[PDB]
């Protein structure tokens, strides 16, 4: 799950915001991966 | 640091047991001011007699 391979192949920077990630609605803050991102 | 990660906007090398979620900025300036100035003046008498 290391994007470094093709971030190295083609020189673009990876997007920072990503949806596949849990989120606490009470504390209102991101929590952790849920949907895997390859 | 085995499969050594890196933050998405790659300018760091996080260890592969942590993940980051990037955002911020905030600042605030504020100042105040106070001045003054005062003055005064005089008095006079005179008598020339005889």
From Swiss-Prot, chain A:
Processing and modification events after translation: Proteolytically processed in two steps to generate the Macrophage-expressed gene 1 protein, processed form: cleaved by trypsin in proximity of the helical transmembrane domain releases the ectodomain into the lysosomal lumen to orient the pore-forming domain toward the endogenous membranes, and processed by the asparagine endopeptidase (LGMN). Proteolytic processing in antigen-containing vesicles is pH-dependent.
Description of what induces expression: By CSF1 in fetal liver macrophages. By interferon-alpha, by interferon-beta, by interferon-gamma and by bacterial infection with E.coli and M.smegmatis in embryonic fibroblasts.
Recorded phenotype for the gene knockout or disruption: Impaired immunity characterized by a failure to efficiently prime CD8(+) T-cells to cell-associated antigens. Defects are caused by impaired cross-presentation of cell-associated antigens. In normal conditions, mice do not show any obvious disease phenotype or a change in immune cell frequencies.
Tissues and organs where the protein is expressed, per its UniProt entry: Expressed constitutively in a variety of cell types including macrophages, microglia, neutrophils, T cells, marginal zone B cells, keratinocytes, splenocytes and intestinal epithelial cells.
Tree of life domain: Eukaryota
Subcellular location: Cytoplasmic vesicle membrane
Domain notes: The MACPF domain includes the central machinery of pore formation: acidification causes a significant structural rearrangement, leading to oligomerization and deployment of the transmembrane beta-strands (named TMH1 and TMH2) that enter the membrane as amphipathic beta-hairpins. The P2 region contains beta-hairpins to interact with target membranes.
Stated role: Pore-forming protein involved in both innate and adaptive immunity. Plays a central role in antigen cross-presentation in dendritic cells by forming a pore in antigen-containing compartments, thereby promoting delivery of antigens for cross-presentation. Also involved in innate immune response following bacterial infection; shows antibacterial activity against a wide spectrum of Gram-positive, Gram-negative and acid-fast bacteria.
Similarity annotation: Belongs to the MPEG1 family.
Oligomer status and interactors: Homooligomer; predominantly forms a homooligomeric arc-shaped pore complex instead of complete rings of 16 subunits.
Protein name, UniProt field: Macrophage-expressed gene 1 protein
């Amino acid at each position: 799950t290391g994007f470094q391979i093709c971030k190295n192949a083609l020189k673009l920077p990876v997007l920072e915001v990503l949806p596949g990630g849990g989120w606490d609605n009470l504390r209102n803050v991101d929590m952790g991966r849920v949907m895997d991102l390859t | 640091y085995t499969n050594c990660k890196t933050t998405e906007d790659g300018q760091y090398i996080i260890p592969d047991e942590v993940y980051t979620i990037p955002q911020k900025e905030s600042n605030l300036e504020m100042n105040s001011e106070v001045l003054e100035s005062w003055m005064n003046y005089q008095s006079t008498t005179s008598l020339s007699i005889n």
